[PDB]
């Protein structure tokens, strides 16, 4: 895409505010701008309501479904910055999302090496599926093509997320919870949900660890990984932009000051290092467990 057309979409220019030379790059068609507005938004996993796309595309929920579809098709990372919409709205968790990517590359016999790096890291972290586990599952898949009961990826993939590392300072958020959903809950699990529903989002340390991991396994909660402008983050070392913002940083510095130096927009950098922390690629410094508030299961 024209870097300039994109510049204008990013900064949310309506059509009329557009330079006629950028209007020239769109064949002077407004509808072509709108087409590239949806495109760029979907590709950059833009939040619907804060963005030009809300004016072109009329159904929000359909914008998010198309967003998730594109993200899955291009093997992108889960849009953790849209977890509220994806989980609460489309009822699709990180785990669900990656399950779909796994199913796609297995059922179509693609290589685990076709998965981008962070995507594969997140598949390992959520499905327990690294390259080796994937080689094993793939073989099971091809092996069972000889037996009367064939298997496809759905038959092999996990049906719940493996245990994930969860920092105490991660924030727990209530998913979309139905009555039948709770009908499967424990009472400590219900205690947590009602806490979150009443008091709002909850620091994860504040809750029972086993209720957090079990709600998380049911998909009844999702995790926010807070990154603020004052946040300082450290990196142990061992599209391509994420792998490039990643190598490019440490600098013993603020995140906002990390955005400026990096000359990449800040909101996009807060999201990216929230993602790096979540996945174990970056380490949010200054975190401090107050053991008087830490629930005892931790």
């Amino acid at each position: 895409m024209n870097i300039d057309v994109e510049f204008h979409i990013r900064h949310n220019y309506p059509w009329n505010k557009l330079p006629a030379n950028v209007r020239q790059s769109l064949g002077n068609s407004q509808r072509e701008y709108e087409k590239q507005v949806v495109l760029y938004s979907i590709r950059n996993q833009l939040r619907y309501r804060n963005n030009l796309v809300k004016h072109v595309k009329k159904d929000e929920r359909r914008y998010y479904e198309e967003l998730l579809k594109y993200s899955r098709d291009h093997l992108m990372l889960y849009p953790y910055h849209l977890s509220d919409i994806m989980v609460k709205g489309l009822r699709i968790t990180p785990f669900s999302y990656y399950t779909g990517i796994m199913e796609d590359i297995m059922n179509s016999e693609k290589s685990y090496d076709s998965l981008p790096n962070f995507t594969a890291a997140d598949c390992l972290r959520l499905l327990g599926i690294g390259r080796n586990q994937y080689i094993d599952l793939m073989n099971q898949c091809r092996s069972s093509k000889k037996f009367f009961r064939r298997k496809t990826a759905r038959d092999l993939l996990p049906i719940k997320p493996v245990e994930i590392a969860i920092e105490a300072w991660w924030v727990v958020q209530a998913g979309y919870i139905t009555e039948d959903d709770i009908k499967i809950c424990t009472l400590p699990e219900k205690c947590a949900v009602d806490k979150i529903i009443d008091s709002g989002p909850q620091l994860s340390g504040s809750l029972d660890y086993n209720v957090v991991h079990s709600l998380y396994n049911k998909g009844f909660i999702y995790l926010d990984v807070p990154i603020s402008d004052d946040s300082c983050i450290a990196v142990p070392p061992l599209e391509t932009l994420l792998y490039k913002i990643f190598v490019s940083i440490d600098e013993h510095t603020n995140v906002a000051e990390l955005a400026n130096v990096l000359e990449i927009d800040l909101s996009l950098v807060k999201n990216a290092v929230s993602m790096y922390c979540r996945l174990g690629f970056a380490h949010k410094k200054g975190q401090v467990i107050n053991l008087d508030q830490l629930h005892s299961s931790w």
Partner: peptide, 21 residues
């Protein structure tokens, strides 16, 4: 079991309003 996008959307627990209508 895990939540599924195929699941039927029932009533919202405690009348918490959806992201979507």
């Amino acid at each position: 079991r895990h939540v599924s996008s195929s699941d039927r959307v029932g009533k919202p627990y405690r009348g918490v309003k959806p992201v979507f209508s």
